[PDB]
Amino acid sequence: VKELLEAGVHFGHERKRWNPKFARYIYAERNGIHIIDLQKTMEELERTFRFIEDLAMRGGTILFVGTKKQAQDIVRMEAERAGMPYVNQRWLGGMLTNFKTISQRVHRLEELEALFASPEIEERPKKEQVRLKHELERLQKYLSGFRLLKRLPDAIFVVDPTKEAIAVREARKLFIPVIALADTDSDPDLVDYIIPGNDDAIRSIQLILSRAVDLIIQARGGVVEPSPSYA
Amino acid sequence: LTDPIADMLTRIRNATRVYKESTDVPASRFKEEILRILAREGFIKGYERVDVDGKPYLRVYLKYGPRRQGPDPRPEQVIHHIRRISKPGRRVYVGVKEIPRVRRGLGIAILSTSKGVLTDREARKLGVGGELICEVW
Amino acid sequence: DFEEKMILIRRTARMQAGGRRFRFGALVVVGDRQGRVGLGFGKAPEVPLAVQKAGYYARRNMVEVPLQNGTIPHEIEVEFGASKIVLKPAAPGTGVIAGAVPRAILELAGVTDILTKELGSRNPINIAYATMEALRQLRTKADVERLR
Amino acid sequence: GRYIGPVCRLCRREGVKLYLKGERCYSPKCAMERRPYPPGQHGQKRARRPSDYAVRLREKQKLRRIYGISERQFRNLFEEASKKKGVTGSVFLGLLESRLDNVVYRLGFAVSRRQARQLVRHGHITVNGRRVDLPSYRVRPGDEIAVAEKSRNLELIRQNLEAMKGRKVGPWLSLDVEGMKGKFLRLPDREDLALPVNEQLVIEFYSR
RNA sequence: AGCGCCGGCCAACUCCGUGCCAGCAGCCGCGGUAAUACGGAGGGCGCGAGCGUUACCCGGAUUCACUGGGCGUAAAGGGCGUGUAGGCGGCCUGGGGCGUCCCAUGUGAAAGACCACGGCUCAACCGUGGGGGAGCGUGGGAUACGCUCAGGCUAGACGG
RNA sequence: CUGGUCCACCCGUGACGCUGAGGCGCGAAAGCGUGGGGAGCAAACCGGAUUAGAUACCCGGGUAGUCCACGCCCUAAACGAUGCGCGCUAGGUCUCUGGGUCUCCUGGGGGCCGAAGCUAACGCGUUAAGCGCGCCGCCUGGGGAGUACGGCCGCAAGGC
Ligand code: SF4
Ligand SMILES: [Mg+2]
Ligand SMILES: [Mg+2]
Ligand SMILES: [Mg+2]
Ligand SMILES: [Mg+2]
Ligand SMILES: [Mg+2]
Ligand SMILES: [Mg+2]
Ligand SMILES: [Mg+2]
Ligand SMILES: [Mg+2]
Ligand SMILES: [Mg+2]
Ligand SMILES: [Mg+2]
Ligand SMILES: [Mg+2]
Ligand SMILES: [Mg+2]
Ligand SMILES: [Mg+2]
Ligand SMILES: [Mg+2]
Ligand SMILES: [Mg+2]
Ligand SMILES: [Mg+2]
Ligand SMILES: [Mg+2]
Ligand SMILES: [Mg+2]
Ligand SMILES: [Mg+2]
Ligand SMILES: [Mg+2]
Ligand SMILES: [Mg+2]
Ligand SMILES: [Mg+2]
Ligand SMILES: [Mg+2]
Ligand SMILES: [Mg+2]
Ligand SMILES: [Mg+2]
Ligand SMILES: [Mg+2]
Ligand SMILES: [Mg+2]
Ligand SMILES: [Mg+2]
Ligand SMILES: [Mg+2]
Ligand SMILES: [Mg+2]
Ligand SMILES: [Mg+2]
Ligand SMILES: [Mg+2]
Ligand SMILES: [Mg+2]
Ligand SMILES: [Mg+2]
Ligand SMILES: [Mg+2]
Ligand SMILES: [Mg+2]
Ligand SMILES: [Mg+2]
Ligand SMILES: [Mg+2]
Ligand SMILES: [Mg+2]
Ligand SMILES: [Mg+2]
Ligand SMILES: [Mg+2]
Ligand SMILES: [Mg+2]
Ligand SMILES: [Mg+2]
Ligand SMILES: [Mg+2]
Ligand SMILES: [Mg+2]
Ligand SMILES: [Mg+2]
Ligand SMILES: [Mg+2]
Ligand SMILES: [Mg+2]
Ligand SMILES: [Mg+2]
Ligand SMILES: [Mg+2]
Ligand SMILES: [Mg+2]
Ligand SMILES: [Mg+2]
Ligand SMILES: [Mg+2]
Ligand SMILES: [Mg+2]
Ligand SMILES: [Mg+2]
Ligand SMILES: [Mg+2]
Ligand SMILES: [Mg+2]
Ligand SMILES: [Mg+2]
Ligand SMILES: [Mg+2]
Ligand SMILES: [Mg+2]
Ligand SMILES: [Mg+2]
Ligand SMILES: [Mg+2]
Ligand SMILES: [Mg+2]
Ligand SMILES: [Mg+2]
Ligand SMILES: [Mg+2]
Ligand SMILES: [Mg+2]
Ligand SMILES: [Mg+2]
Ligand SMILES: [Mg+2]
Ligand SMILES: [Mg+2]
Ligand SMILES: [Mg+2]
Ligand SMILES: [Mg+2]
Ligand SMILES: [Mg+2]
Ligand SMILES: [Mg+2]
Ligand SMILES: [Mg+2]
Ligand SMILES: [Mg+2]
Ligand SMILES: [Mg+2]
Ligand SMILES: [Mg+2]
Ligand SMILES: [Mg+2]
Ligand SMILES: [Mg+2]
Ligand SMILES: [Mg+2]
Ligand SMILES: [Mg+2]
Ligand SMILES: [Mg+2]
Ligand SMILES: [Mg+2]
Ligand SMILES: [Mg+2]
Ligand SMILES: [Mg+2]
């Protein structure tokens, strides 16, 4: 699936706010902006995907991590596609290291489903139907992708390892592999399966997350093709 | 620059602690014989007589362990520890009977004898002593 | 299962208006006497809780020490802060020559013959910590050759 | 000289039975059978955790009290073992088990090491024919510990050798009963004697 | 059969007496009317013809740190240059072989220390036998490093 | 009139180097000597307030001194409380000053934030407090005390 027309989609960005450990994935600086060795992207992407399919083919789940407003909606698109958990809003410290306890929070969301389903005493004073529905909508805003996760993942897919350094910090604390899409402002050594590429253009994020899902769905039996993408 | 031998050991140590593929040291026949042993014992991949700006150097190719899993990916070193022993301020010489055993055996002591630069194991075989240059593990 | 040994139980205090209010700290080492040992420090508002909480982290922080006939392979020296620990291999009829703190860690990891020495600050916490990192860096003739 | 006072209080203190009398040690009248708690006003009070120093001291006193030997002679035997070759622990027990009064006890000549001492001390024992009244005599492999001929017609040694006619001894020993004489074959192992004593703790006591 | 000790360090706890008194005390500290810390008693711990005390030496004290420490704020960078002695010093080659390394040889008394055996009934004590070493004299040998002598070089330094 | 220093050229010399016990020179202010000068300011001093008092803070006066020449004194929170030299170990940003080809690159300074690492922590971090070599100075519990005695220096104060 490893398209080579990613050059039309990103070839990296970000001038000199770089991280000198990312020098091994740079070709030069065009406008004074750091531009990525797409071949280095290619080679890593192949090794990166070789890990992903292997994990799908064994029924392993992959928690997708993206909060920056660019990747935020599309990590919801592509992870709902793959039927696999995401976190698009505020990342919650301890979503891995304190999983059992944040997982005590989705249980509460679960019971507000079987409560606001009906009809279990709507004879609660109108303060309550107003209050719990607020809590419900709130719980829904942050846990809509995490509730799908019922146990420590086997990998996490991050779109900015600098932005999501907390999640990387938890997953590494738990020996969980970390695949990610990094550009020049990120620390490579902290990620296990690298995708060196622009992580600010929705262009790049879509071409990487969707093709990542395409490997996920195909390695779970029965393929499918084009999926959403705003112009 | 008062001690080229300690400058080379330190160039390596500063290079290995940041995980360089290589680092260049100013060249000399005594230095090569010292690197000759670091290769023949696996502390380095080896070296090559390169030149920089017209000056003879020694490009030493470093070697590390497998990447690690956890909060610290950085891999274990192969030269955990290398330090000068005999110095310009205090020459150190041992006879064959007093040659020390670096790290119970897992480490090498590098000596200069009148049969050439030798490890402590080599030196005990040939039965000679000399100036205790350094120790590595 | 794992044998536990309390090493340190101290009471710290903190000040407020109205007076001081305490808290307890538990230094616990766990091990099997076969090559597996862990150290954890536990703090809680009462002694038994902190003791139990310390046993918990001790299992979440272990180290396999390459026992060889009941001694360590090579001598090692580690500094943790201002505390320094020295360990030296020793033959069968030796024993475990160590202060109370490092003795507990070596004993539960199966070490039966070792010479040790504390130097620098003898703070039990930092000494216990320095003994773990010393065991953690012990290496066999195998790993030596594996690296080269 | 040796400790000569009440001997059941030792067992009650050490928390184990030390067979310091022979006969009553197996009866229901044994102190550890009736009051298995330390002597004195506070014996029946709840014990608090002993310090590491207490532990090692208790083990050392347990080992020492077993032989009824002085701390001086005890420590000297230990120091010899520490300077001796190999493992101090084994050698210590070995040199302990090589005392004449101890071998005389092991051979069933006497029901207690105290009795053995008074037997040796009163000269009722010989070593390789040669009479020896020294409790601290060191027996060596190949020796022979016999009852004195001018004492063979003694009630106490008679009843005791009666009760030994087919009783085993340590592998390192033999006993020709009826002839009233045995042999010291070899210096024992720790395996050959399951004394209720971890000896390493005694090493650690003296290493402070 | 006695002597020390039983607040923590440090092994061994209770009752009375006393009430910041009398007293204890190696350090930290005990005593102001329920003192495991003073005094006695019962009990307990430790040793035993000894047990404690005082003095002194080494240890613990990597607390003069060669092994094996330090100096921004803990004790500790000289107020700053300049420079004498001294300490230390770059790349390549050859001579010498002072240091250094190796071999041989002489010396390294006896006693003591150590390993084995043996003699006093054991031990102490004692006898017999066993293995060395550093260091220094001598002869022989090595030359990487340091030194010295000689010849080159330009990366230090100095000058145009 | 004169010192240091940086840059470009890579032209000359050929390790001529680093450090530096002693020595010698420099050394803020206050102070001293001889002479001059004296507006402002201002120890001492006098007076008014303030205040319970106010030998102070505040106010009105005011002499040394502050200024110049020459000669002494030689101290300091003389501080970055951080000796000098060399080599090595991510970067980002502001700035002074040179040379490019002037996008930027590259030297030499001066700051800030930080990689690895160090540190008891605070913090340091290519201007190290990192990793190493050389050499010098210095510390070894608080007080007594930078005191006494001695010696050397000073006109004295007083310094070492
Ligand atoms: S009777 Fe029991 S308590 Fe008394 S000496 Fe014998 S074994 Fe010990
Ligand atoms: Mg980005
Ligand atoms: Mg040395
Ligand atoms: Mg291991
Ligand atoms: Mg410490
Ligand atoms: Mg330190
Ligand atoms: Mg060994
Ligand atoms: Mg200390
Ligand atoms: Mg202390
Ligand atoms: Mg028995
Ligand atoms: Mg124990
Ligand atoms: Mg031994
Ligand atoms: Mg008779
Ligand atoms: Mg028994
Ligand atoms: Mg001792
Ligand atoms: Mg005593
Ligand atoms: Mg009290
Ligand atoms: Mg004691
Ligand atoms: Mg006690
Ligand atoms: Mg009175
Ligand atoms: Mg009372
Ligand atoms: Mg007392
Ligand atoms: Mg009392
Ligand atoms: Mg006696
Ligand atoms: Mg005496
Ligand atoms: Mg002393
Ligand atoms: Mg000392
Ligand atoms: Mg030193
Ligand atoms: Mg110190
Ligand atoms: Mg200075
Ligand atoms: Mg001074
Ligand atoms: Mg010289
Ligand atoms: Mg040289
Ligand atoms: Mg030469
Ligand atoms: Mg030559
Ligand atoms: Mg020579
Ligand atoms: Mg000799
Ligand atoms: Mg002799
Ligand atoms: Mg004999
Ligand atoms: Mg010797
Ligand atoms: Mg010679
Ligand atoms: Mg020359
Ligand atoms: Mg030059
Ligand atoms: Mg020039
Ligand atoms: Mg030129
Ligand atoms: Mg020339
Ligand atoms: Mg100078
Ligand atoms: Mg000077
Ligand atoms: Mg001046
Ligand atoms: Mg002035
Ligand atoms: Mg003046
Ligand atoms: Mg005056
Ligand atoms: Mg005057
Ligand atoms: Mg004047
Ligand atoms: Mg005058
Ligand atoms: Mg005047
Ligand atoms: Mg005037
Ligand atoms: Mg006035
Ligand atoms: Mg007034
Ligand atoms: Mg008045
Ligand atoms: Mg006034
Ligand atoms: Mg005024
Ligand atoms: Mg005025
Ligand atoms: Mg005046
Ligand atoms: Mg005047
Ligand atoms: Mg001066
Ligand atoms: Mg300043
Ligand atoms: Mg400066
Ligand atoms: Mg100063
Ligand atoms: Mg100070
Ligand atoms: Mg200096
Ligand atoms: Mg220094
Ligand atoms: Mg510039
Ligand atoms: Mg310009
Ligand atoms: Mg700069
Ligand atoms: Mg900073
Ligand atoms: Mg860091
Ligand atoms: Mg340091
Ligand atoms: Mg910088
Ligand atoms: Mg650099
Ligand atoms: Mg600078
Ligand atoms: Mg420092
Ligand atoms: Mg003092
Ligand atoms: Mg003075
Ligand atoms: Mg003064
Ligand atoms: Mg004077």
Q: What is the CATH number of the domain that holds D54?
A: 1.10.1050.10
CA angle A176, A178, A180 (to 5 degrees): 165
Do D66 and D113 lie in one domain? The reply is no
By C-alpha distance, the chain C residue nearest B137 is C144
Interface mutation vs chain B, best among A172, A174, A186, most B CBs within 10 Å: A172
D132 touches strand E (CB under 7 A): yes
Task: Please report, as a single letter, which amino acid is at residue A34.
Answer: H
> For C112, which DSSP code?
-
Nearest CA in chain A to B20: A21
Going by C-beta distance under 8 Å and a sequence separation of 6 or more, which residues neighbour residue A125? none
Dihedral sign, Cα of residue A179, residue A181, residue A182, residue A186: negative
Instruction: Name the phi and psi angles at B109, rounded to 5.
Output: -100, 130
CA–CA separation, A69 and A93 (whole Å): 19
Give dist(CA B6, CA B12) in Å, integer: 10
Q: What separation in angstroms does the CA of A120 have from each of A114, A115, A138?
A: 9, 6, 21
In this structure, what are the phi and psi dihedrals at residue B72, rounded to the nearest 5 degrees? -115, 95
- What Rg value do the Cα atoms of chain D yield, rounded? 18
- Choose among C71, C62, C72, C84: nearest CA to C130: C84
For A143, left (φ over 0), alpha (ψ -120 to 50), or beta? alpha
- Please tell me the distance from the alpha carbon of residue D24 to that of residue D134, in angstroms, as a whole number: 27
CATH number listed for the domain at residues B2-79: 3.30.1370.30
**Does D35 lie in the same domain as D112?**
no
Q: Whose CA is nearest to atom 4 of ligand 1?
A: D8
Mark whether D153 and D164 lie in a shared domain: yes
Residue D2: inside a domain: no
Residues D59 and D83 in one domain: yes
Q: Is C144 on the interface with B (CB under 8 A)?
A: yes
On whether residue D155 sits in a domain, the answer given is yes
A37 CA to centre of ligand 84 in angstroms: 74
Radius of gyration of chain A (CA): 19
Identify whether the C-beta of residue A52 lies closer than 8 Å to the C-beta of residue A187.
no
CB atoms under 10 Å from CB of A165, counted, come to 15
User: Any idea what DSSP says for residue D99?
Assistant: B
Class of domain B80-137: alpha beta
**A105-114 — which CB contacts under 8 Å span 24+ positions?**
A105/A139, A105/A143, A106/A139, A106/A143, A106/A146, A106/A147, A108/A139, A109/A136, A109/A139, A109/A140, A109/A143, A109/A147, A110/A147, A112/A136, A112/A139
β partners of residue C25: C10, C43
| Separation CA A175–CA A168 (nearest Å) | 10
CA distance D89 to D84: 11
Where do we find the tokens 């600086």?
Answer: A29
- Token pair for residue A163? 């932005």
Residue D1 lies in a domain: no
Q: Is strand E in 7 Å reach of the CB of D54? A: yes
Q: How many domains does chain D have?
A: 2
**Structure token digits, residue A6:** 């990613």
CA distance C18 to A66: 48
Q: How many CA atoms lie within 13 A of A38 on its CB side?
A: 12
Q: How far is Cα A91 from Cα A163, in angstroms, rounded to an integer?
A: 10
Nearest to C109 by CA among C132, C127, C86: C132
Say yes or no: do domains B2-79 and B80-137 share a fold. Answer: no
Q: Can you tell me the distance from the alpha carbon of B80 to that of B137, in angstroms, rounded to the nearest whole number?
A: 6
The closest of A57, A50, A61 to A96, measured between CA atoms, is: A61
- Asked if strand E comes closer than 7 Å to D207 Cβ, the answer is no
Q: Are residues D28 and D84 in the same domain?
A: yes
- Residue D174 CA to residue D181 CA, distance in Å, equals 9
Q: Give phi and psi for B87, each to the nearest 5.
A: -140, 165
The domains located in chain A, with CATH, are 4-91+148-231 (3.40.50.10490), 92-147 (1.10.287.610)
Sign of CA dihedral D166, D167, D170, D175: negative
In b/e form, how buried is each residue of C45-60, taking b as 16+ CB within 10 angstroms?
eeeeebbebbbebbee
Structural contact between residues B51 and B99, judged by C-beta atoms closer than 8 angstroms: no
β-partners of residue C114 are C89, C96
Q: What is the 3-state secondary structure (H, E, C) of D51-62?
A: CHHHHHHHHHHH
How remote is the C-alpha of D132 from its chain's centroid?
18
Same domain, D85 and D120: no
**What DSSP line would sit under C71-97, residue for residue?**
B-SS-EEEEETTEEEEEEE--TT--EE
User: What torsion, rounded to 10 degrees, do the Cα atoms D140, D142, D145, D146 define?
Assistant: -160
The answer to whether residue D104 is domain-embedded is yes
The parent domain of residue D134 ranges over 97-184
Which positions on chain F have an atom < 7 Å from some protein CB? Answer: 17, 85-93, 103-104, 115-117, 119-121, 130-135
Strand E contact nucleotides, protein CB < 7 Å: 1, 9-14, 42-49, 62, 87-93, 99-103, 114-116, 121-123, 134, 141-146, 155-156
Please tell me which residue of chain C has the smallest CA distance to B62.
C148
Ligand 1 contact, D30 CB (< 6 A): yes
How many of the other CB atoms lie within 10 Å of CB of B23? 18
D18 and D86, same domain (yes or no): yes
D36 is in an annotated binding site: no
Number of neighbouring beta carbons within 10 Å of residue A208: 27
Alpha carbon distance A199, A90 (integer Å) = 18
**Rounded to whole angstroms, how far apart are CA atoms C7 and C38?**
13
Find the D205 Cα to ligand 12 centroid distance in Å: 16
Residues D174 and D152 occupy one common structural domain: yes
Contact yes or no for A206/A5 (Cβ under 8 A) = no
The partner residues of C9 in beta bridges, in order of sequence, read C26
User: CA B5, CA A194: separation in Å to the nearest integer?
Assistant: 40
Residue C5: CB less than 7 A from any atom in strand E: no
Residue D19 lies in a domain: yes
Ligand 1 touching residue D95 (CB < 6 A) = no
Cβ proximity of A157 and A212 under 8 Å: yes
Whether the CB-CB separation of C72 and C89 falls below 8 Å is answered with: yes
Whether C31 and C2 have beta carbons less than 8 Å apart is answered as yes
Ranges of each domain in chain B: 2-79, 80-137
CA B117 to chain centre: 11
Report the candidate in D82, D207, D50, D198 with the shortest Cα–Cα distance to residue C99: D207
The string of DSSP codes covering A106-117 is: HHHHHHHHHHHT
Q: Would the annotation count D148 as a binding residue?
A: no
Q: Which domains does chain C have, with CATH numbers?
A: 3-63 (3.30.160.20), 64-148 (3.30.230.10)
